[PDB]
Design a protein around this ligand. Structure first.
Ligand SMILES: CN[C@@H]1[C@@H](O)[C@@H](O[C@@H]2[C@@H](O)[C@H](O[C@H]3O[C@H]([C@@H](C)NC)CC[C@H]3N)[C@@H](N)C[C@H]2N)OC[C@]1(C)O
Ligand SMILES: Nc1ncnc2c1ncn2[C@@H]1O[C@H](COP(=O)(O)CP(=O)(O)OP(=O)(O)O)[C@@H](O)[C@H]1O
Ligand SMILES: [Mn+2]
Ligand SMILES: [Mn+2]
Length: 175
């Protein structure tokens, strides 16, 4: 989908110009770390510096969009027909971190690629951690296929053993 891919470029170019880091998350982050589009994506998940929220809102507005809805964890925005699902990360000693996520959730290095361009994305461990929360809200056997396949793909990329010990850590945290 050329519109989403073009929109991701436009957002990141604008953010780059003002030295605003943004991390692609969710489905697109998986595809970015793989360097391959694997399916249609329903939205664009973004992680932003929480104390610079206004700068991200201003880029959304510059691009002709607007903030649509506040959620418990962040906010949705709409640029044309495309949805941006935006969550804050907060400065933690020497890096931004998503609250309660595994350390390294928001690496300063651009470790994914989208349409040949390096992009910052959330770590595999942070991608997978959000599926653990999802699992407590819906059993994995009850997930839409696309989400099962995306999870399994992230898990194979990181390594199944690394996933199972991360899952044990999640269970310990939230026991
Ligand atoms: C707009 N739809 C979103 C969906 O994309 C999905 O959003 C996830 C959202 O579920 C996810 O939240 C998780 O992490 C939250 C918190 C620990 N992050 C610091 C607590 C809730 C937990 N589900 C966020 N980290 C990332 C966000 N893109 O789930 C909620 C939702 C409202 O259906
Ligand atoms: N109802 C829900 N409750 C909690 N977490 C959810 C959720 N639905 C999905 N998630 C988690 O939040 C992440 C982002 O969710 P979504 O944006 O809704 C789907 P996605 O994996 O990004 O595919 P997409 O590319 O088609 O949007 C998912 O990767 C999953 O980890
Ligand atoms: Mn998504
Ligand atoms: Mn989303």
């Amino acid at each position: 989908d050329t519109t989403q891919v073009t929109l991701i470029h436009k957002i990141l170019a604008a953010a780059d110009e003002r030295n605003l880091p943004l991390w692609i998350g969710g489905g697109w982050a998986i595809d970015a770390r793989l360097g391959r589009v694997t399916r249609k994506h329903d939205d664009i998940d973004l992680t932003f510096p929480g104390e610079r929220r206004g700068e991200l809102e201003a880029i959304v507005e510059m691009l002709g969009g607007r903030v649509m809805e506040e959620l418990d964890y962040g906010f949705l925005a709409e640029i044309g027909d495309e949805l941006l699902d935006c969550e804050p990360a907060w400065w933690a000693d020497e890096a931004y971190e998503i609250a309660e996520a595994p350390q390294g959730s928001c690496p300063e290095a651009a470790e994914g690629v989208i349409a040949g361009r390096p992009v910052r994305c959330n770590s595999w461990e942070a991608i997978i951690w959000d599926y653990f929360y999802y699992a407590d809200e819906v059993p994995p056997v009850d997930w839409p296929t696309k989400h099962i396949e995306s999870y399994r793909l992230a898990c194979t990329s990181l390594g199944a053993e690394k996933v199972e010990v991360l899952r044990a850590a999640f269970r310990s945290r939230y026991a």
